[PDB]
Amino acid sequence: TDPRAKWVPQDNDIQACDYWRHCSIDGNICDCSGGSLTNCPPGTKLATASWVASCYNPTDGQSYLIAYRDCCGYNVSGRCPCLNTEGELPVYRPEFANDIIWCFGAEDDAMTYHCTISPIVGKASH
Amino acid sequence: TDPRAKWVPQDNDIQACDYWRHCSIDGNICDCSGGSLTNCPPGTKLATASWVASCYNPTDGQSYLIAYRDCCGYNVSGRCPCLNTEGELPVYRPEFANDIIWCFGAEDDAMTYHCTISPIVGKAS
Amino acid sequence: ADDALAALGAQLFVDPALSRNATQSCATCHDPARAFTDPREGKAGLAVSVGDDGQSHGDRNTPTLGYAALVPAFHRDANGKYKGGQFWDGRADDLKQQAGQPMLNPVEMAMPDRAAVAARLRDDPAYRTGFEALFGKGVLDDPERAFDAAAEALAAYQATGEFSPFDSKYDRVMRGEEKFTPLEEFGYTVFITWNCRLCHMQRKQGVAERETFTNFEYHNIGLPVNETAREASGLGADHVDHGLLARPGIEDPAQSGRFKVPSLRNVAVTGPYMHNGVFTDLRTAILFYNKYTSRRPEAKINPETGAPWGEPEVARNLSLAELQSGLMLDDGRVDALVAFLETLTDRRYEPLLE
Amino acid sequence: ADDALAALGAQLFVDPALSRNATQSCATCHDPARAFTDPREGKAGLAVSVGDDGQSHGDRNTPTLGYAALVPAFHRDANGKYKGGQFWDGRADDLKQQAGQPMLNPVEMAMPDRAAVAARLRDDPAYRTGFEALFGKGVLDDPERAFDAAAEALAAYQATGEFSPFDSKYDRVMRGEEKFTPLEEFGYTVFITWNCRLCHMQRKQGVAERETFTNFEYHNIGLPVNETAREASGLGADHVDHGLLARPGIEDPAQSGRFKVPSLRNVAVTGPYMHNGVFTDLRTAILFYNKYTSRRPEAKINPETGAPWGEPEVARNLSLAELQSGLMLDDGRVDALVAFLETLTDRRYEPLLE
Amino acid sequence: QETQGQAAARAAAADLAAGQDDEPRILEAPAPDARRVYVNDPAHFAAVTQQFVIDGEAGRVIGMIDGGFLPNPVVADDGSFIAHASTVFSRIARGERTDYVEVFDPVTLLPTADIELPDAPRFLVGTYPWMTSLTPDGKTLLFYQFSPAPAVGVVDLEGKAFKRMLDVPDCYHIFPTAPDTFFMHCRDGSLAKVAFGTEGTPEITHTEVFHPEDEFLINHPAYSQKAGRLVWPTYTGKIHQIDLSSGDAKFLPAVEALTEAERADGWRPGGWQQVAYHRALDRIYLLVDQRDEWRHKTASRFVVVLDAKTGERLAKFEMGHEIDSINVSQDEKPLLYALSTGDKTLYIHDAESGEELRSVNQLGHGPQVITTADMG
Amino acid sequence: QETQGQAAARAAAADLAAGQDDEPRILEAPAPDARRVYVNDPAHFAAVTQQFVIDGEAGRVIGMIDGGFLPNPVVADDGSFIAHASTVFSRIARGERTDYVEVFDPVTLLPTADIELPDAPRFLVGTYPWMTSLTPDGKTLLFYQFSPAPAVGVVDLEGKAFKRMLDVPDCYHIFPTAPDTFFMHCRDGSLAKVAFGTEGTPEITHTEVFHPEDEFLINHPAYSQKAGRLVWPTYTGKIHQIDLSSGDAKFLPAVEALTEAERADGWRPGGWQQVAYHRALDRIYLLVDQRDEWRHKTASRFVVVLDAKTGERLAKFEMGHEIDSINVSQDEKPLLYALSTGDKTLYIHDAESGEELRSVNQLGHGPQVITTADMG
Numbered sequence A: 001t002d003p004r005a006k007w008v009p010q011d012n013d014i015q016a017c018d019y020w021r022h023c024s025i026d027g028n029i030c031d032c033s034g035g036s037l038t039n040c041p042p043g044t045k046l047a048t049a050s051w052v053a054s055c056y057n058p059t060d061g062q063s064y065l066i067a068y069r070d071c072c073g074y075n076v077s078g079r080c081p082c083l084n085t086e087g088e089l090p091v092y093r094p095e096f097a098n099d100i101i102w103c104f105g106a107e108d109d110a111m112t113y114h115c116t117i118s119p120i121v122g123k124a125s126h
Numbered sequence B: 001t002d003p004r005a006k007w008v009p010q011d012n013d014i015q016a017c018d019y020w021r022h023c024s025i026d027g028n029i030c031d032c033s034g035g036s037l038t039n040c041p042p043g044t045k046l047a048t049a050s051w052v053a054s055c056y057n058p059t060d061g062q063s064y065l066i067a068y069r070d071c072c073g074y075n076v077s078g079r080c081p082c083l084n085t086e087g088e089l090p091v092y093r094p095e096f097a098n099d100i101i102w103c104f105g106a107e108d109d110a111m112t113y114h115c116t117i118s119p120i121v122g123k124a125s
Numbered sequence C, D: 001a002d003d004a005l006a007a008l009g010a011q012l013f014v015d016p017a018l019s020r021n022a023t024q025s026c027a028t029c030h031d032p033a034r035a036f037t038d039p040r041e042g043k044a045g046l047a048v049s050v051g052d053d054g055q056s057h058g059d060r061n062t063p064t065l066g067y068a069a070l071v072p073a074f075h076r077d078a079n080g081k082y083k084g085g086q087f088w089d090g091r092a093d094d095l096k097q098q099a100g101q102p103m104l105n106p107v108e109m110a111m112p113d114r115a116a117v118a119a120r121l122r123d124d125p126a127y128r129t130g131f132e133a134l135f136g137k138g139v140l141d142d143p144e145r146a147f148d149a150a151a152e153a154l155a156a157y158q159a160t161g162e163f164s165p166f167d168s169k170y171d172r173v174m175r176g177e178e179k180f181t182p183l184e185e186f187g188y189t190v191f192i193t194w195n196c197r198l199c200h201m202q203r204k205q206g207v208a209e210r211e212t213f214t215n216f217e218y219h220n221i222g223l224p225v226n227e228t229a230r231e232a233s234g235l236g237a238d239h240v241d242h243g244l245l246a247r248p249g250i251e252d253p254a255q256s257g258r259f260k261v262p263s264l265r266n267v268a269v270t271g272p273y274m275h276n277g278v279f280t281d282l283r284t285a286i287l288f289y290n291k292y293t294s295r296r297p298e299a300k301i302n303p304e305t306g307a308p309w310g311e312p313e314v315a316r317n318l319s320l321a322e323l324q325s326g327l328m329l330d331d332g333r334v335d336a337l338v339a340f341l342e343t344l345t346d347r348r349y350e351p352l353l354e
Numbered sequence E, F: 001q002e003t004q005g006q007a008a009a010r011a012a013a014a015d016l017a018a019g020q021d022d023e024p025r026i027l028e029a030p031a032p033d034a035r036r037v038y039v040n041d042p043a044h045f046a047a048v049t050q051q052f053v054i055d056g057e058a059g060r061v062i063g064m065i066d067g068g069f070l071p072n073p074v075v076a077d078d079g080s081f082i083a084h085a086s087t088v089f090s091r092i093a094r095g096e097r098t099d100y101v102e103v104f105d106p107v108t109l110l111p112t113a114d115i116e117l118p119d120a121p122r123f124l125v126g127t128y129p130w131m132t133s134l135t136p137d138g139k140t141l142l143f144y145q146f147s148p149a150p151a152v153g154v155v156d157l158e159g160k161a162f163k164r165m166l167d168v169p170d171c172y173h174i175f176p177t178a179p180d181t182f183f184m185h186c187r188d189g190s191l192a193k194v195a196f197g198t199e200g201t202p203e204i205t206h207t208e209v210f211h212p213e214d215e216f217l218i219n220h221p222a223y224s225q226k227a228g229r230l231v232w233p234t235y236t237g238k239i240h241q242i243d244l245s246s247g248d249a250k251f252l253p254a255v256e257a258l259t260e261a262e263r264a265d266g267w268r269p270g271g272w273q274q275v276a277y278h279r280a281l282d283r284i285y286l287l288v289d290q291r292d293e294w295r296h297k298t299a300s301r302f303v304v305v306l307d308a309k310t311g312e313r314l315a316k317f318e319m320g321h322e323i324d325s326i327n328v329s330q331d332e333k334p335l336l337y338a339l340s341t342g343d344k345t346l347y348i349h350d351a352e353s354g355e356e357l358r359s360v361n362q363l364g365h366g367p368q369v370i371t372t373a374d375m376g
């Protein structure tokens, strides 16, 4: 893979960094440490905060907002690490910024990063 | 390269895992994180415990007792990891056993492993 | 029958002969010109509505009927969460069970009983015709049948496209007909990433075919009593509105103080806000949420009064996991949310946005 | 000088005419049959020695002269550590500076002054011949010169192979001539991996040429007063033996309580042990180190007394960094250290090992 | 042949297409079963470490547990809990040390106990499974102390409290046989039986010396607590077997994992967990390769399988990777687990054919220790 | 030719032959100088992390410092100390959080202060140098807080105590210009000047807006406190230069770091620390490559150099590796540091010719941040 080429999404393998919902993920895919595409691994705490991105779904042609909520309270999983930045903006536009640990709202005030989930939260307005 | 072949010591580079004095080292060579062959990096604490091995010096054809000492109180350096086991014996012969963290005696009760030094303490006989 | 039944409901909806003194119809409190809410000023401003006797005030704010027909019938989901129903406390199962209640409520339309209602229906030759062609001969002579039929017709009218047109700017944008302004788009983004989406979107994940900006769940967000409204309703200084727990058959004390999450469609034009009409301005309703997150002193003060928000009417069962998000909305994000929420106004109420 | 000079020292060394009452020579306290240490029992056992007057006891134990010639002259190294010298407190710079002191010490050989010493030398025709051949005619008529010459000869004698023969089992094994027993081999291994090697080896690293199992440094290992020897010395119950700090010109309070690391050569035959002879048995000397490492009850108890070791005479400047090694010697390792230390006995003393 | 990621992509697409909602939440691991396998990563002496919980049947990570410096994992054989003895410091690898035991629920992985061990008593060594051990009832955890002297600490998991340190002789490892008794291997070449009450010195009995002093017994013997079987290879692949089932040690005839000719041609065991033992089949698995005699911690590429009663060779597997540790599931038709520290990968083989079935990669920095429960 | 390890073997062998003794001890790092460079490894969000102290002239690691979760390193410009703001937890990555600042001696690397920050106030983010900053007199450390709202904490390094949090507007990053003043970049496109040299409320003033809402200013601008120069690239390689030397902000014309033909042919900056600034030479260096518009955090293989004063291009170097971050030494004939996160290697280059001189590999797990002192 040319790292500088335009990123190309697929809808056939959620553990790969070009899976379409991971278009602005930073960290690790939760499905690789005992969570799933939209659930956290046992023992971790699910944040309510997230960064978002509009990600195109090559299965149906639609663009969906994905809320990258973190699973927190564990050291980083080290499995399936990915970093994509489709639409990703600097820190002063934090809703689109993905270097921030989005662990706010997690139970037990957990704030360490373990992995990110990729749920759809609505339709893109663009 | 062949990990199972008999280890061949050299006397030309102390940062390589086949340097003659590292014949029973386990961990990381301190010269690679700011120490030297026989000194610890700044900020770490030099232990007084050691495990010992008889290491052959290819330069003079003599064997020397290397009493390995750990530099302690820092997370593992991650630079120049090596594991050799020339004459290394299991844990019930602790003086020749190298999976033990030999940090005893280190200042400030430091017991985390950072790297190992390779000083000579005697001729083997 | 479908069109016809809804047509009968349309007539009943605006007919003040369904009130004891004949001064009020559904449309009096649920005025079509105001997104089906009550424009009339009472002793507590617009917070609660006055009934047909001209004196009795309710204790809760009159909600829009717009999009009410999208709410599921009342039930408990597999996670033990109540959802759906009608009234702010869910105590009616659906629109049909709700519809007869204001007719018989002495603080609203105030008809003494079902037989009184049937008698008014029978007075009108047009009702005889219209009810009998839908429900059979003599339906109006049987008070139980007449009242059940009137409720059915009103429920059917409320299920028509008129009440739920899906033609707000939000909808046009999502159909790709136009774009949000930058401020609106930023408000949509905030609304979606911040804690509002835990409560004010239909689904936990995925997308809704007919989104109405509520998950139909019951939450206690820890509002104070609206003092002027509570004084006007006459319920007494020692009254507590227990919300969902007041539904008969609900016994779990953990439901005390929880109210149905309202749809945010037409919110910009249906002030004042919350179950008791306590906040007049949309921006105040949004700012109330910072009391759970902000550390600035101003966050503890209701900007409409200059006093602290007030102790919660029911200080237990608050939805803290959702409300204590760890993040405070700055004034720019509050501006953005107001802009985004104004895009949920049906086309016919756009001119009201001033 | 060389050969003839040491032969003159040899005669002086065994001559009781250098003591006031002619009862004692160097060899009386440094008896060559007992590795140059004192087999005589005064009022405190073998801990301290009795002078020529038959009554005066010292306050320190008489050390071996074997291998003393390998000690560097007293100096401060660049790392701030004092090293070398003679006596347990280093107060003599070297053997030559040491040699005259017992002759004039009233608690030892008790000659009144240099003049009285020279008069004794003059009395013996063999000394007139031998001193004059080496130092010139009339040397013995000049008490300053006669005294200095006697010291020179004594130091030269002590630097001969007789005193430092390097023919112990350890030396033979290092030459490849035989092997340690398994127990001696284990002891050697412990010695070189445990804290002993930090003080009782010549070098910090590398290979020593003529190892004598001391780094010549000064340490306070926290020994208690030897009560019976201290009573016998008459120095008084309030006395404190400050070790190196007592050397003239040392003023640094950090040196209080520190003593020269003794060579462990011949240690198995030169009991009792330590600067004050407090422990009779070699096993006890080794067990002393466990007081700093073992938490067991028995580690606090001197096995020779059944009572706690006692507070240090000087409870400051202890070498805790070396002594608090985190590991205790079990009986197996103590047994092995004894076997190892016995291999440091010169060949001529091997018969004393039982 | 469809991967787990591919299957999950189709399920997620089907839910999206169907309009199926589902609440993002914290998953539970599936119930413990015979094919669950735990891989611990001591991470080449890093101050913090990880353990991976794996469904060996699916080849899928089902959970993880964080640990401190060189922690010792244990797994209840009945599946009811897992636990570890761990070490942390107040400033990463410096400052005040705290040693402690955590017990976790094997489904939520939440800690159900956190039991401080006073005076930083753990032995910090490259991880040996039998340096910390559960009693057969699961109520007591015993851990080894080396400094200042060999000792064994007793931790009451039921009462959630550290009890006391036991004085033992110059011995190593801990093989429990009852609520109050365990065995150790001693420097002198005997085993020591240690029986302890609520107070006092333990009753200590030694067996006969069962090995010469120049025969070297590896740091990773296999021990089946339910069989009472201790399987102890030497550096040359001679295997000692000790039957603790009666309550006392009985030595079984020695067997050789390699032939005389193979040993003469350089064959020796090597790795980390070099030996596994299947209880129901009464079978020994040993990692072996050709190597110089002092390369005994290097990986090996072959596994020999032998009948524990007769010493007959049943199979010799070419593993097709550099394997450091092996273990097996304890069910019928077991899996043979083969962990590569260098690849950071667990390879999952059919124990009967030796065929590689599936693998789980990205297991930390230097994974070394495989543990399974014996649930049968 | 001769490597550091070879020269050290030659010396050791010489000491051995000659019988030269030496005492095993803790070394001191050599005195801070202009060629010392620090590399911080955020370790792709691991709970513990490392910083490497390197002699850029020898290409040698001279020391290390441990840190906790996503620490923010700072280096006093005069070489007198270094410090970080760091975060630890009572059980690895879970349990009670403690945030703290440590100050270290730059030769012994021993901590000389450890100052707890109450209520776990640090912002946890991929590491941005100007999210924690020293005042020019070295007496104060300022750190950013994001939750519940943008805020800035003040730590007194001289009195070794946390002082207070400053409420600020919706702004980001911290560029101190005086003992009592710093600037931040606000969402609205202005800068905010914050004068805080009192226990009372700070005086906050905004500059004019200096960029439009569709230009995106990167997270890693270069700031020279001694020059008062803030060099702020956008995603397209437009460079905003802000002169803060009068104590107030003066905005220079924004120049394009990439040529007209380069921008037409897909060139854009990209990586982590994408920009460096040499004060004495008044030169700007920017990491660029051909890439899609949304691959802005990927490595780049070229560095363009331009005269900050005239905007003239001076050089374009082909770096020969995948480079994420760059910086320069501040002395006369500087080094250009080029850090690869993927190789975990620092490439050390001659800044004038761009030629690779030497490299330092094995720098942790995902090293990202280079810092140097401006000692001149």
Ligand code: HEC
Pocket: C013, C024, C025, C026, C027, C028, C029, C030, C049, C050, C051, C052, C058, C060, C061, C062, C063, C064, C065, C068, C085, C086, C087, C088, C089, C095, C098, C099, C100, C102, C103, C107, C108, C109, C154
């Ligand atoms: C005097 C004013 C008034 C009149 C007349 C009135 N309503 Fe209401 N309406 C209310 C108030 C107040 C509520 C909130 C009551 C509560 O939650 O207890 C309400 C709630 C409802 C709801 C529940 C909607 C929701 O979101 O929970 C429906 C449906 C409804 N009205 C329909 C009707 C119909 C149909 C009529 C005529 C038969 C009618 N209303 C007459 C004041 C009135």
Ligand code: HEC
Pocket: C194, C195, C196, C197, C198, C199, C200, C218, C219, C220, C221, C223, C259, C260, C261, C262, C263, C264, C267, C270, C272, C273, C274, C275, C276, C282, C285, C286, C289, C319, C322, C323, C337
């Ligand atoms: C925890 C669930 C929950 C969260 C989170 C939440 N809300 Fe609400 N919202 C409610 C409920 C329940 C009500 C009605 C409360 C009542 O009247 O008792 C409400 C009422 C409102 C109203 C008044 C509607 C009306 O018709 O009176 C507005 C406006 C509103 N919410 C906006 C928001 C915004 C914007 C956010 C994000 C800052 C938000 N809410 C977060 C549950 C929530």
Ligand code: HEC
Pocket: D013, D024, D025, D026, D027, D028, D029, D030, D049, D050, D051, D052, D058, D060, D061, D062, D063, D064, D065, D068, D085, D086, D087, D088, D089, D095, D098, D099, D100, D102, D103, D107, D108, D109, D154
């Ligand atoms: C009455 C006993 C006695 C006599 C006689 C005596 N010594 Fe000593 N010797 C000692 C004692 C006691 C010490 C230790 C004194 C001290 O450290 O302060 C000592 C120490 C020494 C030392 C220092 C050795 C070392 O390791 O520190 C030398 C050298 C020495 N004696 C040589 C001599 C010579 C030569 C003579 C004859 C001139 C002599 N001794 C006579 C008791 C005696």
Ligand code: HEC
Pocket: D194, D195, D196, D197, D198, D199, D200, D218, D219, D220, D221, D223, D259, D260, D261, D262, D263, D264, D267, D270, D272, D273, D274, D275, D276, D282, D285, D286, D289, D319, D322, D323, D337
């Ligand atoms: C910190 C330095 C240091 C360490 C470590 C040390 N020693 Fe010593 N040792 C001394 C000093 C100093 C003396 C003399 C102390 C005194 O008498 O005041 C001594 C005395 C002895 C003696 C008595 C010798 C004599 O002639 O009286 C023996 C035996 C001995 N040590 C053995 C050991 C053994 C075995 C070990 C390791 C277990 C050991 N030492 C560790 C410094 C040390």
Ligand SMILES: [Ca+2]
Pocket: C037, C061, C062, C063, C270, C271, C272, C273, C274, C277
């Ligand atoms: Ca309202």
Ligand SMILES: [Ca+2]
Pocket: D037, D061, D062, D063, D270, D271, D272, D273, D274, D277
């Ligand atoms: Ca003695």
Ligand code: NA
Pocket: C044, C047, C226, C227, C228, C229, C278
């Ligand atoms: Na009011």
Ligand code: NA
Pocket: C244, C245, C246, C247, C248, C249, C250, C251
């Ligand atoms: Na009820």
Ligand code: NA
Pocket: D044, D047, D226, D227, D228, D229, D278
């Ligand atoms: Na005595």
Ligand code: NA
Pocket: D244, D245, D246, D247, D248, D249, D250, D251
């Ligand atoms: Na003095």
